[PDB]
Every structure is written in structure tokens, then in C-alpha cells.
Amino acid sequence: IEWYGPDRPKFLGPFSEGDTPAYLTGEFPGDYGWDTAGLSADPETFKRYRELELIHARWAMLGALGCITPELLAKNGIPFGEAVWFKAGAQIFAEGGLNYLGNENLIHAQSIIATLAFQVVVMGLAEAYRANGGPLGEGLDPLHPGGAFDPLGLADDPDTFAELKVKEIKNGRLAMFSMFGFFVQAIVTGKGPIQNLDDHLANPTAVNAFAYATKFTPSA
Amino acid sequence: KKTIREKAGWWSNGGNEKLSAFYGPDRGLWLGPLSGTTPAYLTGEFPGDYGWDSAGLSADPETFKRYRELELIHARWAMLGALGCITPELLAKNGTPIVEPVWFKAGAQIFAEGGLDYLGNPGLVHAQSILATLAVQVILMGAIEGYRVNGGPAGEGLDKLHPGGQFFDPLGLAEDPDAFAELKVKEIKNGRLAMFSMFGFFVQAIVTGKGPLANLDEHLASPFTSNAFTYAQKFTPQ
Amino acid sequence: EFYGPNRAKWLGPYSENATPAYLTGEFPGDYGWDTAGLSADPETFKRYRELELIHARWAMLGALGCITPELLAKSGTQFGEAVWFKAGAQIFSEGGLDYLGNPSLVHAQNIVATLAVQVILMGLVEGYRVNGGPAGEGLDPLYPGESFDPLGLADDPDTFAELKVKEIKNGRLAMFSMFGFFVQAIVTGKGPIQNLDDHLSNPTVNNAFAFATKFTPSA
Lengths: 220, 238, 219
Ligand code: CHL
Ligand code: CHL
Ligand code: CHL
Ligand code: CLA
Ligand SMILES: CC1=C[C@H](O)CC(C)(C)[C@H]1/C=C/C(C)=C/C=C/C(C)=C/C=C/C=C(C)/C=C/C=C(C)/C=C/C1=C(C)C[C@H](O)CC1(C)C
Ligand SMILES: CC1=C[C@H](O)CC(C)(C)[C@H]1/C=C/C(C)=C/C=C/C(C)=C/C=C/C=C(C)/C=C/C=C(C)/C=C/C1=C(C)C[C@H](O)CC1(C)C
Known about the structure:
Number of helices of chain C: 4
Shape of chain A: globular
Radius of gyration of chain A: 22 Å
Largest sheet of chain C: none
Radius of gyration of chain C: 22 Å
Structural class of chain C: mainly alpha
Structural class of chain A: mainly alpha
Number of strands of chain C: 0
Chain A: Chlorophyll a-b binding protein, chloroplastic
Distance between the termini of chain C: 54 Å
PDB class: photosynthesis
Entry title: State transition supercomplex PSI-LHCI-LHCII from the LhcbM1 lacking mutant of Chlamydomonas reinhardtii
Oligomer: part of a larger assembly
Number of domains of chain C: 1
Distance between the termini of chain A: 55 Å
Helix content of chain C: 40-55%
Keywords: Supercomplex, green alga, photosynthesis
Bound molecules: chlorophyll B, chlorophyll A, the ligand CC1=C[C@H](O)CC(C)(C)[C@H]1/C=C/C(C)=C/C=C/C(C)=C/C=C/C=C(C)/C=C/C=C(C)/C=C/C1=C(C)C[C@H](O)CC1(C)C
Organism of A: Chlamydomonas reinhardtii
Helix content of chain A: 40-55%
């Protein structure tokens, strides 16, 4: 395994030698040679698309975590009102309000306007500092700053920094694909994805996705 | 100058202006005479060039050849779809006992009691499990679609869109240069027509919920009452 | 401001490096927002500028054509169906499509003939946009002039560029408003000035969060 250069692990393996793009060399992390749609021909579109991919990846990682750890954590102990992720916004409208750990003494969140207003105000300057400038650094790598973001300092040697970049982008593409799976298997079942996992593990042959295949057929 | 039998096109030997209307700058365009500025990269050397890149997505030539690949593959898939959507309904109106001949409900036939009878016959396919069907589909399609991009047992160094060797042109219609260049634009025009018609199949299945041949019969019976506008009130937001 | 390298940008004070190098301030409303890089190629930039201004003018025309029957329902003429997402059903009524509630003014019956006359006029006037015609011939396809400006407000080029950036800013606000009309028609089911009447009745409950629950699957 190399993850760079011309002999890299590619998305079709043996079927990837004639498909492989001429604009897609072995430079950037995660380049499996997959631009069959042709959307990275000029390098600044590829730069904005790599930035888009890494930001969507790093958001979908924490999105999958905030998806399954309420449901798993409610399965272990610590019961909630609406433990599933895609009813989790409805806990503001509850008579007891959204709570972080469910207990009544933490936050007492009854307002949706205050939370949304505060997070918009703080993330305006946060994502603006992400775009350019900021007190933690201005002219760094805009996708991989480091410095005031690395208390442990795992970007010391360029070899382990490069392999951390490729496992970052691979875990993030897995998280984006699985978050797409969370999105679609929420709406075809109406039930939680960990509860979908136990439903699949109870009956693998007939409680799979194909039981919900006749659901979306149009009426009349 | 020109006599009557040449204007009808009796003699297929002296036809050299046949590709002049589909290739080169003096070809037909998308808005006809109401399309003056053809995009300067769509020079007409490719089949299906009606000068239409209004959204400008195909200015770069690499993106343009990838979009040409996607267009021809989607064209052939939609051609096979629009032939394979109506023909169960055509054979059900024939009298062959297909039990759910509409295409948008044919996938649920494998969840029946007797499985998936192919032409309504247990002597045919009679597939029960959707799981082994999708498994052999993903194995066979992985092999075929991986052979497609970089060659394989049916041609290795051939063209990625038009191989035409001993396996993909076995009848040999594309031996001639001009006949191949004419049937290329014939192929992509039939494929764009079938892509438009498959989009029509999708929207017609969504908003009506009946068969496309049932939609054709309900438009042939009442054209002015049973148009697309009598189902325009079906997505009103209450 | 509004042109050149020292113009108004989309992040404002935090917009000195995120703006792309190919978005130089010569075209109207160049706030430097190409965060997906889709207009990096100049032909993509020109075609997307054409799509943006045409979508802009169609959106502002659609915004006024959607809200003015609502303001006239406030004013007092009832209408065949004031609600813009139920406005197409006037031609399906028994009395037909009366324009201002007047049965002797339009009284349209056939929706198929309305679509036929509509496509026969609109295909011609949309194909005339590309390569001139009776109005113009070979002008700027985004800013023709000389037949669609009977008053002719494009005299001074500084005021012409000012009106250009004013047009494209009103147009981005208009597509914003039409997207809002689209996604608050489907979640509420009431007209947009009627949603304004709800939000002015009680401002803290008649929000989008009153209807933020209705799109859960729930088996
Ligand atoms: C040699 C065999 C081989 C095959 C068959 C594949 C298969 C694939 N790999 Mg690959 N790989 C292979 C070798 C290898 N891969 C990888 C590592 C990777 C990675 C990291 C990735 C891939 C990805 C892909 C996909 C890219 C093409 C595509 O998008 O399909 C398009 C066609 C389909 C997806 C059809 C299959 C689905 C199904 C049959 C149809 C569904 C029908 C629905 C019912 C219709 C929907 C209903 C409507 C109403 C919405 C494809 C599925 C990419 C991927 O996972 O994308 C999802 C990807 O990110 N591979 C390695 C390690 C180096 C390989 C080693 O040899
Ligand atoms: C000179 C007159 C002339 C006109 C007006 C057109 C018109 C058109 N041709 Mg062209 N052609 C013309 C001459 C010629 N064409 C062709 C050969 C072709 C081909 C091969 C193709 C075209 C296509 C097109 C379309 C390209 C633009 C588009 O996609 O519009 C799209 C927008 C509209 C059509 C308007 C929207 C429809 C409706 C009126 C409004 C919406 C109504 C709904 C009720 C809205 C409700 C929906 C809600 C829910 C959202 C356009 C309709 C392409 C096509 O068919 O694309 C569809 C195409 O592939 N033409 C030749 C032979 C050389 C011509 C010779 O003179
Ligand atoms: C200094 C602070 C400052 C910041 C941080 C921004 C940044 C912004 N400006 Mg701005 N500007 C700022 C000052 C100025 N601007 C401008 C001129 C402009 C213009 C002309 C424009 C902007 C626009 C924008 C927006 C572009 C990014 C975006 O689309 O949001 C992306 C992030 C989100 C959408 C997150 C939304 C928040 C919330 C989480 C949503 C809730 C999520 C849902 C619940 C989930 C959905 C559920 C399911 C069902 C799908 C953003 C708010 C553009 C705009 O308005 O686009 C909309 C625009 O056209 N600015 C000027 C004049 C010089 C400024 C003065 O200083
Ligand atoms: C990689 C993350 C991941 C994981 C762990 C799961 C796991 C699961 N999904 Mg989710 N899903 C995913 C990704 C994932 N899916 C993605 C990317 C999509 C979008 C296409 C979906 C869409 C989806 C729907 C719509 C549904 C599920 C369901 C399920 C459950 C039953 C399995 C099933 O029906 O197959 C569905 C699997 C897919 C559609 C594709 C997933 C990709 C896999 C990893 C590749 C196939 C490998 C497989 C082991 C070999 C199959 C052999 C043969 C059948 C072809 C199971 C818990 C069902 C459920 O809730 O059960 C109760 C259900 O209704 N999933
Ligand atoms: C590569 C290629 C190649 C060639 O070119 C072709 C093509 C095809 C074009 C391409 C492809 C592409 C793709 C695949 C894409 C996809 C994407 C995705 C899916 C994403 C997701 C993505 C996803 C995502 C982000 C998600 C996210 C999420 C988040 C943040 C959040 C979450 C959450 C949480 C925490 C919790 C709570 O309670 C809820 C919520 C709120 C919900
Ligand atoms: C040109 C241009 C130009 C400018 O400038 C810009 C723009 C506008 C962007 C552009 C345009 C574009 C377009 C139009 C697109 C469209 C497409 C389509 C429609 C496709 C289809 C597509 C379609 C398709 C694929 C289809 C396919 C089909 C198939 C597979 C099959 C199916 C089937 C069958 C047999 C039946 C059974 O039972 C089942 C199934 C399975 C269901």
C-alpha cells in the first residue's frame, strides 16, 4: 500500500487502468481515480471540491457519532424521551425540554430561537475564520491548519501526517456514505438505525431493506 | 439542375450531404434558426451536436468527453428501459398472463407466493429470492461494467464507447465510415428520445400511478379531459 | 465599492482570501462567492451569469405575480383563486379564469389552448433572445438595450453599472424570496402574505418551527 503515486490503490482495482484520469495524479489523499463524471478537470475546481469533500467528511463523522451514540447510549442506560436522532429536534417542544444527558438539572432547553440565534452568531465568525484569517492563524493550509488545533501534535513527520490524511479522508468518505444510509433508512422505516440493526440481526433474510421496497409505490 | 429522383433520394451512392446536416458547422441546431451563437467548443465533430450547452457544463474538453460517455451510457440504458417498460404491458394486452405488467410494480413480483414468473410461466425463470438475484446481478454487472472501461474478453484496446469488434458489432452494420458516422447520430438521437421518454415514465408513474400504456389509452379515449392537467391538482400543498 | 478589487464582498471584513482570484470586479454583483468553483472556467462564468440574470428577472416577475393577488385580496377584489399555489385551478372552475374577478375580461376555459398559445409566444420570444430579431440584432444577450428601454436608463455608464448591480442584487433577493415561497408553500399550505398575517398575528408561535415536525416518516 502506498496511497500516493501512480501505483495507488484504486476504486476498481484491476478495472481501473483505462478509466483513470490524466488530470488525477497520485498527489492528494484518497485519490482512487474516481472521476467518471468528469468534475475535476481544472485544478481549482478540484481544490474547491477537495475542500468540499473534507468539510463534508469531517461534518459527517461527527454527524454519524451524534446519530448513533444517543441511541446506543439509551440502549445501554440513561433513558431519554425521544432517544432516536431524527426526532431529536422535537425535544425542544417537549413539556420538559431537551436535556443533554436527560436529567432535569443540566440545561432546561425550552427555546429553539435562542439556540439557533446563538449558533448562527458564533458560527458566522467561526466559519469566517475557517475561510480566511482568524486568531489561530491566517495563511496556513486551509484544509489542514494544525498549530492551535493540535494539542497533541500528530502532524510531526510528513509520512505519518500523509497517512493520517489518507485515513482521515477514508474514514470521512465512509462516514458520508453511512450518513447517506442513515438519511435514507430513516425515511423508509421511520425507525432508528440501531433499531434497524437489531431488526436486521433478528431476521436477516426478510427484515432487510427489501421489506420496505413496496412502500414508496405511488397510489391511484 | 437536379431532377426529381435525386430530390426524392433514389440513389444512395451519391449521398455525400447526409452528414452535412448532422456534422460540421452547416448542421441543424437546437433552436434551429433561433440559435445563432453556437458554443465554440461544440464544433459538430461528435454525434448529436445541436449546439446545446446553455448551462455551459461542457466547456472543458475532458468534462465534455466524460459527459459524452455518460450521455451515451444513459442513452443506451434508457433505450433498453423504454423498450423494457412497455413490452410487459404490450404482452399483457396481448394475452400473455403477466400478473403485474406495469414497470413500476414489477419489482414486487418477487415477493409473491410463486416468486417471479418470467412470462407468467413457472416453466420459466421462477425466481423466488430477491437476495440471490441481486447478488448474481452485482457480480455479473461488476464483471461487465469493470470490463467496460479498460477492456476484457470482448475487446481490450477498443474505443470506450464504440468498441464494435466481433462481439459488439457482430452483424457488421458499422463497417462503412459514413454509415457508422450516420448511425452514431441516429443512436444518440434515439437515445435522447428514450431518455426523455424514461423521464416521462418516471413522472407519469409518480403523479398518476397507472401504466404508461394505461396512460396512453386514457389519453386516446379522452384527450382533452384526461391530459396531464387533470393530474396537476395532485401535489397541492394543504 | 461594488466593483474592483476593493468592492463589497460576501463575507465582508473576513473576505480577503476566500474570494477566488478569477472573480475580478467587472461584472455586476461580483461579491466573490464561488465556494464550489463552478464558474472557474470563463465560459462557465458567462453561462452562469446568463442563467443568474435570467433566473433573477424571472424570479422578480414571479414574486410580484405571486404576491399582487394577495395584496389585492387584502384590497378587496376576491379573485378566482388568489392563492398562487392554487391559482392554476381558476381555469378548472365553472366560471373560468376571470382576470380581476371580471367575467368579461379573460374568461379562459381551455388550459390546453392556454398552454399552446403560451408556448407559441414564449418559444419565439425565447429564441429571439439568442440571435436578435425584430427587437434587436447582435447586442449583448444579457443587456440588449435600444428596444426594451423606451425610457433608456442606460445612458451614463457609471449609473448603468450602478443599475446593473442594483438589478442583480434585487434579483438575488428575488430568487431568495421565490425559494422561500416554494418551501413555505409546501410546509404551511397558506399563501405568503397569509403567512405574513400569521407571523404578524403572533410572532413567536407562527414561525417555521411550528411546522418543523410534519416531515418525519414515522413508519
Ligand atoms: C474488481 C472488482 C471491483 C468492483 C466490481 C468494485 C465496485 C465498485 N467500487 Mg471498488 N470495486 C472493485 C475493486 C476495488 N474497489 C476498491 C475500493 C473502492 C473505494 C474506496 C470505492 C470503491 C467504489 C466502487 C464503486 C464505483 C463504481 C460505481 O459507482 O458503481 C455504480 C453502480 C452501482 C452503485 C449499482 C449497484 C447498486 C444496485 C445494484 C442498484 C440499486 C438499484 C436500486 C433499487 C434503485 C434505486 C431506487 C430509486 C427509486 C432511487 C463500485 C460499486 C466507490 C463506492 O463505494 O461508491 C459507492 C468507492 O468510494 N471501491 C478496492 C481497494 C483498492 C478494489 C480492489 O480491487
Ligand atoms: C425555431 C423554433 C424552435 C424552438 C422554439 C425550439 C425549442 C426547443 N428545442 Mg429545438 N426548437 C426549435 C427548432 C429546432 N429544434 C430542433 C431540434 C431539437 C433537439 C434534438 C432538441 C431540441 C430541444 C429544444 C429545447 C431546448 C431548450 C429547452 O430545453 O427548454 C426547456 C424549457 C421549456 C420547454 C419550457 C418549460 C415548459 C412549459 C411551457 C413551462 C412549464 C409548464 C408546467 C405546467 C410547469 C409546472 C411544473 C412545476 C411543478 C415545477 C427547446 C424546447 C431539446 C429538447 O427537446 O429539450 C427538452 C432537444 O433535445 N430541439 C431542430 C432540428 C434541427 C429545429 C429546427 O428548426
Ligand atoms: C461579517 C460577517 C459576515 C458573515 C460571516 C457573512 C456570511 C454570509 N453572507 Mg454575507 N456575511 C457577513 C457580512 C456581509 N455579507 C455581505 C454581503 C453578502 C451577499 C450579497 C450575500 C451574502 C451571503 C452570506 C451567506 C453565505 C454563506 C451561506 O450561504 O450560508 C451557509 C450556511 C447555512 C445556510 C447555515 C444556515 C443556518 C442554520 C443552521 C440553518 C438551519 C438548518 C435546517 C434546520 C436544516 C434543514 C433541515 C432539512 C429538512 C433539510 C452567509 C450568511 C449570501 C447569501 O445570502 O446566501 C444565503 C449572499 O448572496 N453576504 C456584506 C456587504 C459587504 C457584509 C458586511 O459585512
Ligand atoms: C456502510 C454502512 C451501512 C451499514 C452498516 C448499513 C446497515 C444496514 N442498513 Mg443501510 N444503507 C447504507 C449503508 C449502510 N447500511 C447506504 C449507503 C444506503 C444507501 C443506498 C443504505 C440504505 C438502506 C435502506 C434503504 C435500508 C437499510 C437497511 C439496513 C439494515 C439491513 C441491511 C439491508 O437491508 O441492506 C441495505 C443495504 C444497502 C441498501 C446498501 C448498503 C451497502 C452495503 C455495505 C454493500 C452490500 C454488501 C452486502 C453485505 C452484500 C450484499 C450481497 C447481495 C445481497 C447483493 C442494516 C442494519 C434497511 C433497514 O432498515 O433494515 C431494517 C433499510 O430499509 N439501509
Ligand atoms: C466521487 C465521485 C466521483 C464521480 O465524479 C461521480 C460522482 C458520483 C459525482 C462522485 C460521488 C459523489 C458522492 C458519492 C457524493 C456523496 C456525498 C454524500 C452522500 C455526503 C453525505 C454527507 C452527510 C452529511 C454531511 C451528514 C451530516 C450530518 C450532520 C453534520 C449532523 C447530524 C446530526 C447530529 C450530529 C445528531 C442530531 O440529532 C441530528 C443531526 C443534526 C442530523
Ligand atoms: C443537454 C443539456 C444542455 C444544457 O445546456 C444543460 C442541461 C439542461 C443540463 C443539459 C440537459 C440534460 C438533460 C436533459 C438530462 C436528462 C437526462 C435524462 C432524462 C436521462 C434519463 C435517463 C433514464 C434512464 C437512465 C432510464 C433507464 C431505465 C432502466 C435502467 C431500466 C429500467 C427498468 C425496466 C426495464 C422496467 C423494469 O420494470 C424495472 C426497471 C429497472 C425500472
